[PDB]
């Protein structure tokens, strides 16, 4: 039978496929997901228009084995943001796109930019445009009341103004020189550009 | 032959002869992000940072005090030197919420002209494209 429709559809199993452990190939030429890249913001960031950001690594980035410097300090990272903010948001999504090593190594990391403690997006000072959103309505109401008072002393436009200018998205301002992190979203492989050699002793 | 030309170009870049160095640099502000050495060769300004120091962001300060971006290259054996492509009386160093001002106390407005198109006086940049 096919009855018991509600109870029979709440009893449909959820079968999740198992996983098998693998192993990373070369952990000396590897930067894995979830590595934190600490860089200093060069450009001042204002989210009025879509644009491109730039930061420089403040520290050397080692491999997952922790033995080879894969990204040197002073490496330049280029990213971009778009879309602006919505009401109630205080952080913008920044995607870092490419990093250039001072020795000429280039890798396309397309990773999310974060704050100094890894919170998602870049955040700074927020301009909510209070006056541009409410000044028309406030001014219209006050002039209406003043005119009514003057007319009485002889012995809705405010809603229209508010409806048009109430929805102005906020603007984020982030100062130059601020510390940011790049959280690596994919595995970065440096096997094709570096190799190791032992130093002759003394 | 082209390998010979490339070797000559690299030798000319490395030889770095006839260079004058300006070491009159002062600093005020947050000394924890300060370089250990600053100088210029008349074309580029070099700030050297210690091994344990984070590399900060360096900004160009004009007469009115406005900051602006300046291109930089990282040089040195251990990437400990930031070379900025300008000589300026005042510099601004920022890392996070710490700031440090660098003052060139022997600023030469004239400088040395760049007649060759390269960073070295021993290499011409020549117009290959013709056209």
């Amino acid at each position: 039978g096919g009855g018991g429709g509600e109870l029979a559809e709440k009893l449909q199993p959820m079968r999740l496929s198992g996983s098998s452990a693998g192993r990373l190939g070369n952990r000396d030429m590897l930067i894995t997901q979830g590595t934190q890249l600490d860089c200093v913001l060069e450009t001042r960031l204002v989210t009025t228009q879509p644009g491109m950001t730039t930061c420089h690594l403040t520290r050397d980035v080692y491999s997952t084995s922790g033995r080879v410097v894969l990204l040197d300090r002073g490496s330049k990272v280029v990213g971009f943001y778009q879309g602006g903010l919505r009401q109630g948001q205080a952080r913008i999504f920044v995607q870092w796109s490419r990093i250039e090593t001072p020795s000429g190594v280039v890798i396309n990391l397309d990773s999310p930019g974060t704050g100094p403690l890894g919170e998602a997006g870049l955040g700074g000072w927020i301009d909510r445009h209070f006056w541009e959103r409410f000044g028309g309505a406030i001014m219209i109401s006050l002039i209406g009341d003043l005119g009514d008072w003057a007319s009485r002393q002889g012995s809705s436009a405010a809603a229209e103004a508010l409806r048009n200018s109430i929805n102005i998205p906020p603007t984020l301002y982030k100062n130059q020189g601020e510390r940011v992190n790049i959280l690596v979203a994919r595995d970065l492989d440096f096997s094709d550009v570096y190799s190791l050699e032992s130093i002759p002793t003394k | 032959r082209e390998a010979n030309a490339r070797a000559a170009v690299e030798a000319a870049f490395e030889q770095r002869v006839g260079a004058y160095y300006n070491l009159k640099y002062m600093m005020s502000g947050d000394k924890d992000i300060a370089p250990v050495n600053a100088w210029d060769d008349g074309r580029f300004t070099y700030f050297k940072f210690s091994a344990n120091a984070d590399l900060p962001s360096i900004y160009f300060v004009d007469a009115e005090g406005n900051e602006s971006l300046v291109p930089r290259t990282t040089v040195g054996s251990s990437n400990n030197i930031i070379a900025v492509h300008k000589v300026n009386p005042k510099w601004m160093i920022r890392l996070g919420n710490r700031a440090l001002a660098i003052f060139n106390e022997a600023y030469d407005p004239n400088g040395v002209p760049n007649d060759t198109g390269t960073a070295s006086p021993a290499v011409r940049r020549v117009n290959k494209g013709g056209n």
């Binding site: 006056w131 301002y173 | 600093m27 005020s28 502000g29 050495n37 700031a99 660098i102």
Partner: peptide
Amino acid sequence: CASAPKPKQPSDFNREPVNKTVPVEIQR
């Protein structure tokens, strides 16, 4: 009535030489 805050301006009191020693890149 509210403007974006400026970055910190360094204090101009503790002005001291950057170079305590001659750099070795100058070969001196």
